[PDB]
Design a binder for this molecule. Structure first.
Ligand SMILES: Nc1ncnc2c1ncn2[C@@H]1O[C@H](COP(=O)(O)CP(=O)(O)OP(=O)(O)O)[C@@H](O)[C@H]1O
Ligand SMILES: Nc1nc2c(c(=O)[nH]1)N=C(CO)CN2
Ligand SMILES: [Cl-]
Ligand SMILES: [Mg+2]
Length: 158
């Protein structure tokens, strides 16, 4: 199954964080990277007392169960010093979001796929569109037509 993973970092040298994340993603068992996007510098969504993000997307072929993939992405976050605090939408060294897991629809306590807010976020959709221009969501919507509808600001390279 092809999983699409969003990468974000705005602490502790985001370029190094994203490169480390890509290396680690490729080392996940029973999985391999298919495609990687460019790196983008994006202004923060949410609180404004935090640095700009590096955002990117990856396509990962995997035979892991989705929750097992999640276990691995969370391990990578922790390896790269991810902490969590009370604030929502706050800064982080590394975040990995499972945007899609094939065409699956998953609604569980630990895991919601497609990612619950991605259709509202240019910083998730644009890097995804770079690597999967033909992508269709489980609900039948085309990524290309969502981007044209919402007309989110285009991104700048990191
Ligand atoms: N599709 C998905 N990808 C990654 N984590 C997911 C997920 N669906 C649910 N989660 C849950 O997300 C929790 C961690 O949330 P956080 O990483 O703190 C929010 P965030 O990723 O910073 O912002 P966002 O969810 O608003 O994009 C995990 O414990 C995990 O169970
Ligand atoms: N530009 C940008 N802003 C964000 C990001 C992200 O990846 N990029 N993720 C967040 C999740 O809470 C908080 N805000
Ligand atoms: Cl959908
Ligand atoms: Mg997260």
């Amino acid at each position: 199954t092809v999983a699409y993973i969003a990468i974000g970092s705005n602490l502790a040298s985001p370029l190094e964080q994203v490169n480390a994340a890509l290396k680690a993603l490729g080392d996940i068992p029973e999985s391999h990277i298919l495609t990687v996007s460019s790196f983008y510098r994006t202004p923060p969504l949410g609180p404004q007392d935090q640095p700009d993000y590096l955002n990117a997307a990856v396509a990962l072929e995997t035979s892991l169960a989705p929750e097992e993939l999640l276990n691995h992405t969370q391990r990578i976050e922790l390896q790269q010093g991810r902490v969590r605090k009370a604030e929502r939408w706050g800064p982080r060294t590394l975040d990995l979001a499972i945007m899609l897991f094939g065409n699956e629809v998953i609604n569980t306590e630990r895991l919601t796929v497609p990612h619950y807010d991605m259709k509202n976020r240019g910083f998730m959709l644009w890097p995804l569109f770079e690597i999967a221009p033909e992508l269709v969501f489980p609900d039948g919507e085309m990524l290309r037509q969502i981007l044209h509808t919402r007309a989110f600001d285009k991104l700048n390279k990191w």
